[PDB]
Amino acid sequence: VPEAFLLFSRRADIRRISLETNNNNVAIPLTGVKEASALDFDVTDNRIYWTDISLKTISRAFMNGSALEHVVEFGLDYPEGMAVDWLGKNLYWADTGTNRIEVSKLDGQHRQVLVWKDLDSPRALALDPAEGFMYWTEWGGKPKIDRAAMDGSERTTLVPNVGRANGLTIDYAKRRLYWTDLDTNLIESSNMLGLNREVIADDLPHPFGLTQYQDYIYWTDWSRRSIERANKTSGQNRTIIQGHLDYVMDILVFHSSRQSGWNECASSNGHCSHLCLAVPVGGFVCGCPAHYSLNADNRTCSAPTTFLLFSQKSAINRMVIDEQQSPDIILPIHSLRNVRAIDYDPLDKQLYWIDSRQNMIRKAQEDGSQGFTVVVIQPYDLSIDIYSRYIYWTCEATNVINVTRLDGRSVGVVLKGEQDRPRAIVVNPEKGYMYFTNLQERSPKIERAALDGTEREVLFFSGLSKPIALALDSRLGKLFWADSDLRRIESSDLSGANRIVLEDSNILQPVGLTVFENWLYWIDKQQQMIEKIDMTGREGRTKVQARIAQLSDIHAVKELNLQEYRQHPCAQDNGGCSHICLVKGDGTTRCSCPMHLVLLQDELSC
């Protein structure tokens, strides 16, 4: 029968020492760890879990060496407490920086934020999945220990009068709570309701980490560089288990008896498609990934259909206009160095961007899986034709409008000039036109052309300086843009030019804009904020979010009506065309080519 051992983290090392013998100090054979802190485990799985406070990630590996996976890589700021729900097979964690308690599957999937309101600085975290309750300590404001159901609901404050508590442990069998008090230098205990409180040991120079096993409590002490042990009720029989161990971060006893109990999730995941979250009354509630919604069946989840995307130098973020005002999530996308522009294909659900470092057009799914480079040349802005499956983009080095198929196959250039310096671009494949910006020497223009480069016309001469971004709404029939030097956002009609200056007031440098549903969102780089304007019966200028550092682009996504999509002529096998597909006039199809080829007699091929 496998015996119990004690896990501890210190610097880059996670080590096991055998209890009942107090030796065999071996390290778990882990690679790539810089600074380990929070520890937990899964006995049935024989897996270990840890936090890296330096790299700001959460990882797992089999005890036996490895099947090492990074389980949470993005969105952590000051990750603190971390714990395994061994029944629902979910991973919980708390973050002091972002002020959120988050959950996900043990393999990192279906990440969801459980509590984010009224949280100051969440620290220690402890789970009771048998009873469906979670417990945490908060360090900000008036320090306290809280309780809530393991879905974030039914939140109460359990211990209102404590110092900064750090070692929060449940003794599952005897129904008690234990924590270290850093301010009062003592170990305290209470029952599950935070009553019948008692101090266990008070002569403590610097207590930090804490665990409970059988009759014993275990703690680490940074002042006397030790892992110490005592009787859980009297506090007597004090012994030094390990000395000369400075800065031991977390300790835990690994044993089957520490993960006992049962709930309704332990059997086939409560039939929930994604997350099964334990609840004190009604056993369980099916949960969903962030931004996703629970269906009528109280079982399956639906992905958000209408949302907003905004990018900065190192991250693409997604936001939704929620009833509960859900927080933004940082999309888990690898190798982002300097994002300059973004777009999104609503047909295959893929995110496209351009990295100005390594100068490439890259694409991935929202979960960060389908990673693929489309264009490998100094791209500036891009715009997707969702019907022809082409991406139109502008090159800064060659000053050209280039069109590439989504799978990376080249279609060709459609516009090049000796004087032309094309920059911002947005396509309108519904009317068969593209719109763009021309940053020519001393003389800038907002232009319009056919998707092939014909029917060119200058829409605006004066009132421009350095227009930087474009947007359009095919429903209403308007074109939007933002001027960087003049700090103003203007609006006009598609074919016509009904120039309105809707905002010109409190702006520093706008760098992006899009239309959501009936709102005009934009992004200010210096002011570091997102703002929106109402298009209909005005609700007035509204602040969306501030404190966003180095933001580059903003993009709106809408639910794609599959019935309305297949009715568009150019989506029906590109209208027969080998290259460019055009719609104009009576709403029929006409083929065209890039600049190195000509249309060939059958008016179909190049």
Ligand X SMILES: *[C@@H]1O[C@H](CO)[C@@H](O[C@@H]2O[C@H](CO)[C@@H](O)[C@H](O)[C@H]2NC(C)=O)[C@H](O)[C@H]1NC(C)=O
Ligand Y SMILES: *[C@@H]1O[C@H](CO)[C@@H](O)[C@H](O)[C@H]1NC(C)=O
Positions touching ligand Y (CB under 6 A) are 46, 62, 64-65, 215, 231, 233-234, 237, 298
Minimum CB distance to ligand Y, residue 27 (Å): 16
Could you tell me how many residues make up the chain? Answer: 606
Question: Choosing among ligand X, ligand Y, none, which partner's interface includes residue 25 (Cβ < 5 to 8 Å by kind)?
Answer: none
How far apart, in Å, do the first and last CA atoms of the chain sit?
A: 75
Among 66, 257, 378, 410, binds ligand X (CB under 6 A): 410
Minimum CB distance to ligand Y, residue 258 (Å): 18
Question: Choosing among ligand X, ligand Y, none, which partner's interface includes residue 298 (Cβ < 5 to 8 Å by kind)?
Answer: ligand Y
Q: Does 400 bind ligand X (CB under 6 A)?
A: yes
For ligand Y, give the closer residue by CB, 18 or 231.
Answer: 231
Tell me how far apart the alpha carbons of residues 437 and 321 are, in angstroms, rounded to a whole number: 30
Question: Choosing among ligand X, ligand Y, none, which partner's interface includes residue 400 (Cβ < 5 to 8 Å by kind)?
Answer: ligand X
Minimum CB distance to ligand X, residue 405 (Å): 8
Structure-token pair, residue 336: 């982002």
Tell me how far apart the alpha carbons of residues 97 and 566 are, in angstroms, rounded to a whole number: 46
Question: Choosing among ligand Y, ligand X, none, which partner's interface includes residue 62 (Cβ < 5 to 8 Å by kind)?
Answer: ligand Y
Question: Choosing among ligand X, ligand Y, none, which partner's interface includes residue 214 (Cβ < 5 to 8 Å by kind)?
Answer: none
Q: Give the angle 467-468-473 at the CA atoms, nearest 5°.
A: 90
Closest CA to 47 of 108, 124, 126: 108
For ligand X, give the closer residue by CB, 252 or 395.
Answer: 395
Tell me how far apart the alpha carbons of residues 180 and 166 are, in angstroms, rounded to a whole number: 5
Minimum CB distance to ligand X, residue 411 (Å): 8
For ligand X, give the closer residue by CB, 210 or 375.
Answer: 375
Among 339, 375, 434, 479, binds ligand X (CB under 6 A): 375
E strand residue ranges, 255-378: 275-278, 284-287, 293-294, 301-302, 307-312, 316-319, 329-330, 339-345, 350-355, 360-365, 372-375
For ligand X, give the closer residue by CB, 17 or 424.
Answer: 424
Q: Which stretch binds ligand X (CB under 6 A): 117-125, 345-353, 392-400, 539-547?
A: 392-400
Question: Choosing among ligand X, ligand Y, none, which partner's interface includes residue 317 (Cβ < 5 to 8 Å by kind)?
Answer: none
Q: Does 402 bind ligand X (CB under 6 A)?
A: yes
Minimum CB distance to ligand Y, residue 239 (Å): 11
For ligand Y, give the closer residue by CB, 47 or 532.
Answer: 47
Residues of span 117-136 touching ligand X by CB under 6 A: none
Beta bridge partners, 458, equal 447
CA dihedral 508, 511, 514, 519 (to 10 degrees): -10
For ligand Y, give the closer residue by CB, 22 or 298.
Answer: 298
Q: Does 394 bind ligand X (CB under 6 A)?
A: no
For ligand Y, give the closer residue by CB, 295 or 358.
Answer: 295
Question: Choosing among ligand X, ligand Y, none, which partner's interface includes residue 231 (Cβ < 5 to 8 Å by kind)?
Answer: ligand Y
Residues of span 572-601 touching ligand X by CB under 6 A: none
Question: Choosing among ligand X, ligand Y, none, which partner's interface includes residue 356 (Cβ < 5 to 8 Å by kind)?
Answer: none
Q: Give the angle 79-81-84 at the CA atoms, nearest 5°.
A: 115
Tell me how far apart the alpha carbons of residues 553 and 316 are, in angstroms, rounded to a whole number: 9
Tell me how far apart the alpha carbons of residues 264 and 270 are, in angstroms, rounded to a whole number: 6
Minimum CB distance to ligand Y, residue 294 (Å): 9
Question: Choosing among ligand Y, ligand X, none, which partner's interface includes residue 398 (Cβ < 5 to 8 Å by kind)?
Answer: ligand X
Q: Does 391 bind ligand X (CB under 6 A)?
A: no
Tell me how far apart the alpha carbons of residues 312 and 340 are, in angstroms, rounded to a whole number: 8
Question: Choosing among ligand Y, ligand X, none, which partner's interface includes residue 27 (Cβ < 5 to 8 Å by kind)?
Answer: none
Q: Does 358 bind ligand X (CB under 6 A)?
A: no
For ligand X, give the closer residue by CB, 413 or 597.
Answer: 413
Residues of span 471-500 touching ligand X by CB under 6 A: none
Minimum CB distance to ligand X, residue 590 (Å): 23
Beta bridge partners, 42, equal 47
DSSP string, 387-446: TTTEEEEEETTTTEEEEEETTS-EEEEEEE-SS--EEEEEEETTTTEEEEEEE-SS-EEE
| H or E element, residue 479 | strand 478-483
Structure-token pair, residue 356: 């100005």
Q: Does 398 bind ligand X (CB under 6 A)?
A: yes
Closest CA to 556 of 322, 305, 363: 305
Cβ neighbors of 539 (< 8 A, separation 6 or more) are none
For ligand X, give the closer residue by CB, 237 or 398.
Answer: 398
Q: Give the angle 296-300-302 at the CA atoms, nearest 5°.
A: 85
How far CA 447 is from CA of 108, 427, 564, in Å, comes to 46, 12, 29
How far CA 239 is from CA of 198, 229, 231, in Å, comes to 21, 5, 10
Among 130, 301, 413, 529, binds ligand X (CB under 6 A): 413
Q: Does 90 bind ligand X (CB under 6 A)?
A: no
Minimum CB distance to ligand X, residue 374 (Å): 8
Minimum CB distance to ligand X, residue 454 (Å): 18
Closest CA to 486 of 504, 500, 470, 469: 504
Minimum CB distance to ligand X, residue 146 (Å): 55
Question: Choosing among ligand X, ligand Y, none, which partner's interface includes residue 46 (Cβ < 5 to 8 Å by kind)?
Answer: ligand Y
With beta carbons less than 8 A apart as the criterion, state whether 19 and 3 touch: yes
Q: Does 378 bind ligand X (CB under 6 A)?
A: no
Tell me how far apart the alpha carbons of residues 554 and 520 are, in angstroms, rounded to a whole number: 11
With beta carbons less than 8 A apart as the criterion, state whether 583 and 570 touch: yes
Q: Which stretch binds ligand X (CB under 6 A): 65-73, 263-271, 383-391, 394-402?
A: 394-402
Tell me if residue 293 falls in helix, strand or coil.
strand
Token pair 């892992």: residue: 227
Among 148, 395, 406, 554, binds ligand X (CB under 6 A): 395
For ligand X, give the closer residue by CB, 287 or 453.
Answer: 453
Q: Does 404 bind ligand X (CB under 6 A)?
A: yes
Question: Choosing among ligand X, ligand Y, none, which partner's interface includes residue 375 (Cβ < 5 to 8 Å by kind)?
Answer: ligand X
Q: Between 187 and 226, how does the x/- string for binding to ligand X read (CB under 6 A)?
A: ----------------------------------------
Q: Give the angle 428-555-469 at the CA atoms, nearest 5°.
A: 70
The binding site for ligand X (CB under 6 A) comprises 375, 377, 395, 398, 400, 402, 404, 410, 413
